[PDB]
Amino acid sequence: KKIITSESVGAGHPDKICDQISDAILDECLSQDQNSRVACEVLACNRLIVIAGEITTHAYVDVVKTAWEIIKPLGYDENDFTIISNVNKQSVDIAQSVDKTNKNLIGAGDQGIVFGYACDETPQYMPLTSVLAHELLKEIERQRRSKEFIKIQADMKSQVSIDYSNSTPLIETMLVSIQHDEDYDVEYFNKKVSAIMEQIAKKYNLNTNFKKIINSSGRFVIGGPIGDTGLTGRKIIVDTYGGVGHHGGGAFSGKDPTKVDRSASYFARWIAKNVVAAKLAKQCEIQLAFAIGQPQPVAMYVNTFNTNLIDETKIFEAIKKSFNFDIKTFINDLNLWTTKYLPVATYGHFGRDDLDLSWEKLNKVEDLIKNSKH
Amino acid sequence: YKKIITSESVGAGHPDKICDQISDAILDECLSQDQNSRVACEVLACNRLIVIAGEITTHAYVDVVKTAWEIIKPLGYDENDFTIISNVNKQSVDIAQSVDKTNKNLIGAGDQGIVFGYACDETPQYMPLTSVLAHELLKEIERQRRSKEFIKIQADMKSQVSIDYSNSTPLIETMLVSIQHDEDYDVEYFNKKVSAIMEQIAKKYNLNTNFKKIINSSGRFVIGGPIGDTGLTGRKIIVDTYGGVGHHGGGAFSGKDPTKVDRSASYFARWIAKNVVAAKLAKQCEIQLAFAIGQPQPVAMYVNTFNTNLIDETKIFEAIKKSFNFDIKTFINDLNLWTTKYLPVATYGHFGRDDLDLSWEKLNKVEDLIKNSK
Amino acid sequence: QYKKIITSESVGAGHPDKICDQISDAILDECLSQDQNSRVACEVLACNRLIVIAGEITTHAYVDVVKTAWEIIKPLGYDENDFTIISNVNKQSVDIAQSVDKTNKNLIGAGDQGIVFGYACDETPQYMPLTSVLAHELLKEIERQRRSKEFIKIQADMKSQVSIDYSNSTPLIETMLVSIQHDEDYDVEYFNKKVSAIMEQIAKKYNLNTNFKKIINSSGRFVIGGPIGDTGLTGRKIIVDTYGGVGHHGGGAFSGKDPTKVDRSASYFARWIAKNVVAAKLAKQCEIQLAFAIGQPQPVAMYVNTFNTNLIDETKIFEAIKKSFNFDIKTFINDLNLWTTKYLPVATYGHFGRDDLDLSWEKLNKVEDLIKNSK
Amino acid sequence: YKKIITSESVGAGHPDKICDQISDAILDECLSQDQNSRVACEVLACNRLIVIAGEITTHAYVDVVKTAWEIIKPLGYDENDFTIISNVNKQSVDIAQSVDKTNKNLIGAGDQGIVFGYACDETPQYMPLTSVLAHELLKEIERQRRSKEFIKIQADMKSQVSIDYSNSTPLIETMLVSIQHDEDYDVEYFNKKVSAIMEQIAKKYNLNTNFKKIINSSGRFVIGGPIGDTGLTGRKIIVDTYGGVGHHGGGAFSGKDPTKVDRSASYFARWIAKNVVAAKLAKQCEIQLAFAIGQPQPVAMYVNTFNTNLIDETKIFEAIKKSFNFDIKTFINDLNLWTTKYLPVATYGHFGRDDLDLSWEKLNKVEDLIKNSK
Ligand SMILES: C[S@@+](CC[C@H](N)C(=O)[O-])C[C@H]1O[C@@H](n2cnc3c(N)ncnc32)[C@H](O)[C@@H]1O
Ligand SMILES: C[S@@+](CC[C@H](N)C(=O)[O-])C[C@H]1O[C@@H](n2cnc3c(N)ncnc32)[C@H](O)[C@@H]1O
Ligand SMILES: C[S@@+](CC[C@H](N)C(=O)[O-])C[C@H]1O[C@@H](n2cnc3c(N)ncnc32)[C@H](O)[C@@H]1O
Ligand SMILES: C[S@@+](CC[C@H](N)C(=O)[O-])C[C@H]1O[C@@H](n2cnc3c(N)ncnc32)[C@H](O)[C@@H]1O
Ligand SMILES: C[S@@+](CC[C@H](N)C(=O)[O-])C[C@H]1O[C@@H](n2cnc3c(N)ncnc32)[C@H](O)[C@@H]1O
Ligand SMILES: C[S@@+](CC[C@H](N)C(=O)[O-])C[C@H]1O[C@@H](n2cnc3c(N)ncnc32)[C@H](O)[C@@H]1O
Numbered sequence A: 001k002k003i004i005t006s007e008s009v010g011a012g013h014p015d016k017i018c019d020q021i022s023d024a025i026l027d028e029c030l031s032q033d034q035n036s037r038v039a040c041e042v043l044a045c046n047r048l049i050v051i052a053g054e055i056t057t058h059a060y061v062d063v064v065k066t067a068w069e070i071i072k073p074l075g076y077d078e079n080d081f082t083i084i085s086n087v088n089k090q091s092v093d094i095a096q097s098v099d100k101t102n103k104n105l106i107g108a109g110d111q112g113i114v115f116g117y118a119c120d121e122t123p124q125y126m127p128l129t130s131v132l133a134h135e136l137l138k139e140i141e142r143q144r145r146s147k148e149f150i151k152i153q154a155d156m157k158s159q160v161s162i163d164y165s166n167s168t169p170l171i172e173t174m175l176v177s178i179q180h181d182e183d184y185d186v187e188y189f190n191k192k193v194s195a196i197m198e199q200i201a202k203k204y205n206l207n208t209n210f211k212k213i214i215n216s217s218g219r220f221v222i223g224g225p226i227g228d229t230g231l232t233g234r235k236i237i238v239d240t241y242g243g244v245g246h247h248g249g250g251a252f253s254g255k256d257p258t259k260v261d262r263s264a265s266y267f268a269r270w271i272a273k274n275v276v277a278a279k280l281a282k283q284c285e286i287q288l289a290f291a292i293g294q295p296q297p298v299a300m301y302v303n304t305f306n307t308n309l310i311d312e313t314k315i316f317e318a319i320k321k322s323f324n325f326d327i328k329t330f331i332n333d334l335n336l337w338t339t340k341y342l343p344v345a346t347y348g349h350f351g352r353d354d355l356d357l358s359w360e361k362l363n364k365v366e367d368l369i370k371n372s373k374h
Numbered sequence B, D: 001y002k003k004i005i006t007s008e009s010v011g012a013g014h015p016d017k018i019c020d021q022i023s024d025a026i027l028d029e030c031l032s033q034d035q036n037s038r039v040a041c042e043v044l045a046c047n048r049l050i051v052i053a054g055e056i057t058t059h060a061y062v063d064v065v066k067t068a069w070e071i072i073k074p075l076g077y078d079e080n081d082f083t084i085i086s087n088v089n090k091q092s093v094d095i096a097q098s099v100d101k102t103n104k105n106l107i108g109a110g111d112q113g114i115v116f117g118y119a120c121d122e123t124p125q126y127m128p129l130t131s132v133l134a135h136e137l138l139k140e141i142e143r144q145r146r147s148k149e150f151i152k153i154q155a156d157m158k159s160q161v162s163i164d165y166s167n168s169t170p171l172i173e174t175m176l177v178s179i180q181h182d183e184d185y186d187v188e189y190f191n192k193k194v195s196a197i198m199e200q201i202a203k204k205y206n207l208n209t210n211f212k213k214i215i216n217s218s219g220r221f222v223i224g225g226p227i228g229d230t231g232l233t234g235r236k237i238i239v240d241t242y243g244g245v246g247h248h249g250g251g252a253f254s255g256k257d258p259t260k261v262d263r264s265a266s267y268f269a270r271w272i273a274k275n276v277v278a279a280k281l282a283k284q285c286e287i288q289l290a291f292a293i294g295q296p297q298p299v300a301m302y303v304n305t306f307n308t309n310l311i312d313e314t315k316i317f318e319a320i321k322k323s324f325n326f327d328i329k330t331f332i333n334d335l336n337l338w339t340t341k342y343l344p345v346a347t348y349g350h351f352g353r354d355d356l357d358l359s360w361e362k363l364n365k366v367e368d369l370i371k372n373s374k
Numbered sequence C: 001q002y003k004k005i006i007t008s009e010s011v012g013a014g015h016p017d018k019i020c021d022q023i024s025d026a027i028l029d030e031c032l033s034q035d036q037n038s039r040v041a042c043e044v045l046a047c048n049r050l051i052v053i054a055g056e057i058t059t060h061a062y063v064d065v066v067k068t069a070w071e072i073i074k075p076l077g078y079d080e081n082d083f084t085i086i087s088n089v090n091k092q093s094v095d096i097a098q099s100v101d102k103t104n105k106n107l108i109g110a111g112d113q114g115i116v117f118g119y120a121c122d123e124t125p126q127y128m129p130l131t132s133v134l135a136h137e138l139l140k141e142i143e144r145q146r147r148s149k150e151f152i153k154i155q156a157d158m159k160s161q162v163s164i165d166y167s168n169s170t171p172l173i174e175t176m177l178v179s180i181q182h183d184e185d186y187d188v189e190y191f192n193k194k195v196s197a198i199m200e201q202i203a204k205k206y207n208l209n210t211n212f213k214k215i216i217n218s219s220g221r222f223v224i225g226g227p228i229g230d231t232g233l234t235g236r237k238i239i240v241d242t243y244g245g246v247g248h249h250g251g252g253a254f255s256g257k258d259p260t261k262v263d264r265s266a267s268y269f270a271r272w273i274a275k276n277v278v279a280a281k282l283a284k285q286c287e288i289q290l291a292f293a294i295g296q297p298q299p300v301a302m303y304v305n306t307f308n309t310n311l312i313d314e315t316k317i318f319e320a321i322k323k324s325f326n327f328d329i330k331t332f333i334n335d336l337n338l339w340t341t342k343y344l345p346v347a348t349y350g351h352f353g354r355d356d357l358d359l360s361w362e363k364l365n366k367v368e369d370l371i372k373n374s375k
């Protein structure tokens, strides 16, 4: 059997708490000052939250109040954490490279490599393993908040394995771990989780006879930052493509759009998704590489995994003709100065049928089709 | 239209790598005193603060300040440069009971997750050439910084290497380096030193010497280390692994004892893949393994040979299953992970290190694989 | 999500409203085969174990309504003892008849007042909305497979609904939904796989994406069906019969009606105009509204809407239509051979864009006239 | 070239409307006795037969003969005019299990389907003027028939009004009425009465009086009601709604309890559209909603403002999502659909009825829409 597996984590997972605080701080800066330079990193461990990084802005963000906005809906209060604010300014050496003399150009905020990915497995143009893993946790957290699923807490993880041996996928295993109250009823808990798992499988017209692994540790009462240290940018595969897509290593949360790790990753997704939606391939991955201070990528590679429906050279040419690779220009084309990032800090940045993200729009299919012709 | 693949590396004074080094230095000290330590040490370094956190249950005592100074003093920092915060929590007893089975003789996985192992035949290291070259550039620059053969530079540095794989012999397309330099440097001397190092590395691998060189594209890099950019443990996971050519499941290595399968199973998967390729069963091999917390074996496995298999894929899969022990306690012991020193892999990658002697890099399973693949 | 997601439906041959439309039109066809001057307005109700055949017929024909009903219901699996049949056939009001039969002038007066809309667009080779085309194709294929036994343990009552995202210039399928009546002992895994493959095969036939949401038997159980599960009546699927909610509708039903009922004949006429306008490349979409008065031989109003997709001035389209078509009711009925057309075939799967049939109102025989008259 | 739009209405003695009235009178009787009734009552009226059929599961008992007599006696019929057939089946238990969820806080949609809600600013009713005028003609004639101000007429009648929208002020182009009359009527009196009523309605809406009048074009209409034409429930769905100016999804209203979304969601969509227009977000608004049997929320929505939007269409869409709850059970309760009497909307249209007090006609969401659209 060909068994592929991906994961997700919930809103009370400690790494995700950090991503949410980073992006909530970013969103508050950008709401006040659209030219903010923000690289906000957070650490959450036991009873300490550290808010750090490099920010140059006209805004003022109350980082304590912002942190409380993320942690109060998970059950924490104002006395649970020491908060350390260590906000440095952006290095003037980086800033002079980004802010070019030509005021219509933005130089890349760093070197690096990013990958964008899309496939035709799901309506989201995402790997089915990742879609199912996120949907499981979104439903559990929805029920936790509405009180349809009682005596659970917000720290949780999922993992879904799919059998791709035949042309119809089968679910092989669904796994969930959910932090629970000391006085929980394990029979009620197992039945709730089993039902949620089946409901998600049925929503995607899949089999319902898969293995279920429910709270395999056998006890999960200690959780959140008490059980495990969180840091920003430690769930980059959960944030992206579940291990089916390649990754260049850059984290998203807490970064303004001049950080190409974020903005060019969104751009690359937008390209790949439109290539696949245009039916030029079943799977498409776009690698882009950058040099600090340079306003365009220094390299690009387009991989269609032998699923291309037209010549690879024509795909590559259609992409070059249909997209503008100037950083300032693609930041503007995707409205990244006015996008709210907090909503993508949980449950993935891509394929979000619950959100309206610019990099998910299929508005380049007509250009790609026209530019790919004979 | 050329096929250009790009990977990166970072130096010992890069702030994320400072954190990885402190994490692994702390781990090495714990394991030297107590081979049953449970350690998950996470570090943040920003401006003038180093935060040492995570979850440790041990009979050892580690002087975290002294350990941090051992990493930062060779980079030019002193005892008054950083506030050091020590926030060492204990391992959750709920996780511990799942890992330390009542049985004895078994170790349960320390978490769920997915890991990937990768190997290819491009280099004697069985690693992607892009990654090998990127690391070799920075190792040589840092060697010269310490010997004073390359003056007026500092320890924060990055590299990026682009290779053109359009034809059967790879060609270097671009080598890029950024190196933190002193205010009073001589840019002409600096450019000449870097150019020569780039050519020397290319010649060491018998490659072309006519490639593009991008040297300090920002045009000024005086501010650096944690002053210029916040570092965190486990934020260079692609640099630590396969440079974007191999998949990644998202787990970080540094600071973790071998019961954390993100580390131990990633090493195990590498060991498998490298032996597959060394046994000439394939030119490239990638192995995915998935885990469930508390369970002593993987819950899923997938083997990809990218259509470079020299025998039937099913026989490779079977030979792997027959030639390795998938029990976690057993593979931890087969790789001598309780007595391996991790600090040396906290810079310049955990894989393909022909400068080190790592158990997961040994070609001691070739014989078994060949026998079991009939 | 913020999107232009447009949705249309279809229903199958064993859907209870469609059973009624088929019995209505089969009765009409038998009358017109015997007497081309028949006046027929045949309405059918099917509930539980009763079929009522009613309406107003004046004819020299004789139709065996029981035998006709059995011709519709036997291929769906019913037998001769499943329904009580009530035949309540009244004559056409002589007050309506004298208005329609203008023997004096050689004219036909409209059989009623009313408004009709004809519609066409360039999305499909049928010149129909893609949502409607796909919805019908799904059910035609499932019913084809039911009869050939390629798809087992299903019954004839079924519905489909297709949602397309038109937010950008290329349409993408958003959702395909089907509900199919199934046997008690069915295998849900086999059923899901069969439906999924049919859905994908229809998408691929039209060169569309195959990664859309699939909603398959959302009720979770559909063993009770046909008139037992739901009452059918003639003329309760007028949007399925026409343009799936993309086109406007004036409210008139088609089935069971002879061509003097302008609800039917003028609807067909308006489709014929709209289709030819679009095929002539005068517009990408065209909707024609016509209004009538009982006893009057021509429409009392007309409006032509090209939805801002006109390729030439709207006044020239309007003029070309007036020069190319004859709006006298008797004349357009004869131009479309409506007295000799068989209507049973259009009582399932829609009256328009039927590339599986040869309908007069679907012929592109006015394109040359429209192009010439638009200059 | 004039832009002439036309709509119709029919009177209380029209045979299709007789059926709609008996359907809704039966429904009202069921709901007065049992608010959890499930009712889908369909009626056929032809020559001398009335058939009362459909699917009802209830604790109520309705005397269907007495109910039918309550509709037909004020139209001049008596107890010996019709054979009455009662064929009341129960609701399919297969449908019922889908609608009446185990989770008793949800109602699943009673069927699949598409509904459209519409509103425009042409009249105080927020309805197309053509429809408003057509209904007003027949309401006034029927009022006069009953008060004996218009003698020697009967209750079967129809109207049709054509308006020229070529210029910014609408002009009436044609008014057409047909009214069933006694054999011994005086045609001159009748023509003058109808002409005056037509002028009186035009003057009520401040319109022109120079339009074409088409009065009893057939030239004789003594035979009428079910003797002249067969009626069925749900055969005037355009007259019931928006006169051909709004789109329609094909579902009928009369005889259905609120779990049939063809009715309840049509009312809900009207309530949205009307409030959008009253809030001055657009001059015309049409809302399409699609449903799946057993699912408690719509599966699709589209909002069309016909390029008359006064703010961005995305902000209208967002304001609607924030201001309305799309859960079926919730919108049924918000509109008090279990306790609304439906008989009054079975003649003269279900929308824009400034002579009734309908929940879906209340402008009680304008403040929410304005607030949520900033
Ligand atoms: C407070 S902000 C803006 C002050 C003033 N409104 C202005 O435009 O100058 C100025 C600097 O404070 C630093 N800073 C430190 N903590 C901060 C916080 N919580 N929010 C915003 N900036 C902060 C950043 O480096 C930032 O560039
Ligand atoms: C298992 S912990 C990671 C290792 C931890 N750092 C240690 O000291 O062993 C990682 C994630 O698993 C989840 N987790 C925490 N305690 C758990 C338990 N008792 N059972 C299952 N999952 C748990 C939480 O989401 C947590 O962030
Ligand atoms: C210091 S250790 C060893 C003490 C004594 N040797 C023993 O065997 O119990 C005990 C606990 O201290 C906590 N601790 C806090 N900081 C520490 C540090 N710097 N090194 C080791 N353990 C630390 C860990 O949770 C660990 O389990
Ligand atoms: C450019 S910084 C990352 C973004 C930064 N947090 C900011 O506030 O914009 C990332 C890495 O690039 C390198 N770096 C820092 N300053 C640099 C410069 N002035 N030129 C080039 N590379 C630099 C250092 O290795 C640093 O860790
Ligand atoms: C049976 S038809 C034709 C009889 C005879 N062949 C003739 O030419 O007079 C005469 C009338 O019967 C009434 N009728 C009742 N049931 C009928 C049916 N089943 N087929 C045709 N006409 C029917 C219609 O009103 C029709 O005008
Ligand atoms: C759902 S029924 C209509 C409401 C019904 N009269 C009642 O009493 O609730 C309308 C159509 O849906 C289909 N239908 C019937 N039973 C169904 C079921 N159990 N699941 C799905 N669709 C069904 C049939 O095509 C039927 O004509």
Ligand SMILES: C[S@@+](CC[C@H](N)C(=O)[O-])C[C@H]1O[C@@H](n2cnc3c(N)ncnc32)[C@H](O)[C@@H]1O
Pocket: D056, D057, D058, D059, D060, D061, D062, D063, D064, D088, D089, D090, D091
């Ligand atoms: C008359 S009601 C039952 C009266 C009894 N009060 C009860 O609660 O059970 C029971 C069934 O009768 C059927 N029925 C037949 N004709 C009916 C009618 N005229 N009014 C109500 N139900 C009728 C419906 O299917 C309904 O669910």
Ligand SMILES: C[S@@+](CC[C@H](N)C(=O)[O-])C[C@H]1O[C@@H](n2cnc3c(N)ncnc32)[C@H](O)[C@@H]1O
Pocket: C040, C041, C056, C057, C092, C093, C095, C096, C111, C112, C113, C261, C294, D014, D015, D016, D156, D157, D158, D178, D218, D219, D220, D221, D222, D223, D224, D225, D228, D229, D230
């Ligand atoms: C004209 S009839 C429709 C077709 C009719 N079933 C037939 O057999 O020809 C439709 C409606 O028009 C009205 N109508 C009936 N007889 C009429 C007449 N003599 N002149 C005008 N309208 C009439 C009634 O309102 C009736 O419900």
Ligand SMILES: [Cl-]
Pocket: B111
């Ligand atoms: Cl984790």
Ligand SMILES: [Cl-]
Pocket: none
């Ligand atoms: Cl970096």
Ligand SMILES: [Cl-]
Pocket: C017, D111
């Ligand atoms: Cl239906």
Ligand SMILES: [Cl-]
Pocket: C112
């Ligand atoms: Cl009518």
